[PDB]
Amino acid sequence: ALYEYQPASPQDLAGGYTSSLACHRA
Amino acid sequence: KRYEKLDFLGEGQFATVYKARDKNTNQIVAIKKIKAKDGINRTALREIKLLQELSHPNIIGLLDAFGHKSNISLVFDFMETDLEVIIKDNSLVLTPSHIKAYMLMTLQGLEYLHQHWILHRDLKPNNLLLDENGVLKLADFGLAKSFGSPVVTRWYRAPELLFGARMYGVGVDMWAVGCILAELLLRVPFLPGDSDLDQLTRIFETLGTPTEEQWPDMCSLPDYVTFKSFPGIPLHHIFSAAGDDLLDLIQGLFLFNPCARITATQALKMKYFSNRPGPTPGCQLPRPN
Ligand SMILES: CC(C)c1cnn2c(NCc3ccccc3-n3cccn3)nc(O[C@H]3CCCNC3)nc12
């Protein structure tokens, strides 16, 4: 049974915080 | 207060765990009783506050919390085993389907967790618990923290965390999910470091020292120390039994750029999971016996 999917400062950027996460959260 | 104690299971830094029975329904649960004058332990309160807001089959469910003055016990669902015991048992064979199933359950739980803006931050095989029906669950949310508003065992710590990242996203879980994956493929800790220097040394000797193209602004992390240019063993030499799709999944999880590192959703969308063979059903996953 094959699986199928179902539905900032440079420091933050280096860590993975892209300033779009906050906007999407807010 | 209606739970009877049956078996003692162990002690940790924060609490002691006992297998217990709900007298009203004869259900098996795990009671984590927290072992000054600051009140209830902040780890217990953190787990309570996070697990009250979450409900997914691949996240450990907080069922109750009771206690006396400044002492509290947390009632979770009872999990039969963890992924560390699965990996360390030489009598168990970890076929590609089994690895895919563990990967899929971990990533689905992580996708729900990250969608609700919570980072686990303590992902490792002993924190990936399995039950008698094969459903993996993220557990030990004493380190979990909400993310989005402007850590991890050393072996599974992401390089950004090892390099001092105060602010970070889903990658710090994703990297751990990579390491667990590698530990599933090798039956041995992929990057068993000693200090915060030796861990990065092993990471860079195995996967290659990242450069600015592979990880921009890597030098802006607070504890950033630059190592030597290690070529890094090719991924198909380390994981000689890994297929091309599995190698692509590993490469995505082990990208040094956390932004470029695949999130849980796009990891779930990789062809490795939709390729043949499909992940084995949870009821057919190996049991450590
Ligand atoms: C995370 C919650 C509190 C939970 C739910 N279930 N659960 C088990 N179940 C048994 C178990 C799970 C994983 C590995 C081993 C065992 N085990 C069975 C018999 C003896 N151990 N152990 C521990 O915490 C465990 C792990 C280590 C700390 N004390 C016991 N915590 C739990």
Side-chain angles (χ1 to χ4, degrees):
Chain A
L2 271 59
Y3 158 85
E4 200 266 281
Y5 178 52
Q6 280 306 284
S9 211
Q11 276 198 30
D12 315 74
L13 289 189
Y17 177 95
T18 193
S19 186
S20 316
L21 297 178
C23 185
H24 198 238
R25 186 49 182 310
Chain B
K1 351 283 174 169
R2 88 193 164 310
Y3 290 102
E4 64 212 309
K5 273 169 26 66
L6 252 74
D7 282 71
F8 166 85
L9 302 172
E11 323 89 313
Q13 175 173 10
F14 296 107
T16 165
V17 186
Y18 312 68
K19 162 144 65 84
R21 269 193 295 154
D22 191 7
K23 280 183 275 293
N24 302 28
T25 175
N26 198 346
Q27 181 173 350
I28 309 294
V29 287
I31 290 191
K32 181 194 288 199
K33 176 211 197 310
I34 311 279
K35 292 172 304 168
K37 81 163 46 66
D38 297 14
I40 300 179
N41 205 318
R42 296 202 194 184
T43 292
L45 287 186
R46 170 162 333 98
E47 161 292 332
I48 287 162
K49 78 199 192 202
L50 295 169
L51 289 194
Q52 289 285 63
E53 329 279 12
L54 303 161
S55 186
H56 191 273
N58 304 117
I59 291 172
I60 193 54
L62 173 62
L63 321 195
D64 199 21
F66 69 54
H68 263 270
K69 46 212 308 167
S70 291
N71 82 65
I72 190 175
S73 89
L74 313 173
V75 183
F76 306 83
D77 284 291
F78 178 61
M79 301 304 284
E80 172 47 8
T81 189
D82 57 323
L83 225 63
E84 198 189 20
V85 176
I86 301 280
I87 283 146
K88 296 187 153 344
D89 274 302
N90 321 99
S91 77
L92 319 192
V93 294
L94 279 180
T95 74
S97 289
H98 299 179
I99 301 183
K100 188 178 295 191
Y102 292 132
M103 277 335 263
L104 189 64
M105 277 190 291
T106 303
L107 289 178
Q108 292 184 313
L110 213 50
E111 165 197 86
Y112 176 112
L113 196 66
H114 292 158
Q115 213 181 102
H116 292 81
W117 300 92
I118 288 141
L119 293 184
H120 189 291
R121 311 197 301 160
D122 208 54
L123 284 176
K124 48 171 157 110
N126 66 39
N127 280 340
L128 302 184
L129 310 188
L130 273 289
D131 47 49
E132 83 289 348
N133 266 277
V135 186
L136 177 143
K137 297 189 164 59
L138 272 48
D140 172 89
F141 283 81
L143 279 312
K145 203 166 187 313
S146 75
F147 81 106
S149 229
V151 278
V152 186
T153 300
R154 162 171 298 110
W155 294 351
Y156 315 88
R157 201 167 303 151
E160 55 272 16
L161 295 174
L162 289 152
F163 272 119
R166 323 278 195 251
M167 284 312 300
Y168 44 87
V170 303
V172 307
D173 286 14
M174 300 325 281
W175 183 279
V177 180
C179 294
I180 294 155
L181 175 54
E183 179 152 10
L184 286 162
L185 292 153
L186 299 168
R187 307 305 295 271
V188 125
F190 182 42
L191 305 158
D194 182 13
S195 56
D196 293 336
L197 190 78
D198 188 52
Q199 187 65 27
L200 290 162
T201 313
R202 279 133 195 294
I203 285 167
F204 300 163
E205 290 161 294
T206 310
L207 299 164
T209 306
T211 36
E212 302 320 301
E213 322 71 32
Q214 311 200 333
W215 185 3
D217 307 324
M218 59 170 327
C219 329
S220 264
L221 291 169
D223 312 336
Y224 178 74
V225 46
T226 169
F227 293 77
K228 280 66 54 186
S229 183
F230 299 108
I233 313 171
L235 255 62
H236 62 270
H237 297 157
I238 307 158
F239 320 101
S240 285
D244 214 327
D245 56 346
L246 180 47
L247 283 162
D248 275 311
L249 171 65
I250 296 166
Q251 224 185 94
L253 298 160
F254 273 118
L255 289 168
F256 296 105
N257 192 342
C259 307
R261 185 173 316 142
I262 55 180
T263 71
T265 284
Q266 60 205 9
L268 291 157
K269 280 184 290 103
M270 307 217 45
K271 208 48 65 217
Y272 163 77
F273 293 104
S274 204
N275 269 322
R276 293 105 64 81
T280 166
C283 72
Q284 270 165 3
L285 285 163
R287 267 75 178 140
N289 64 97

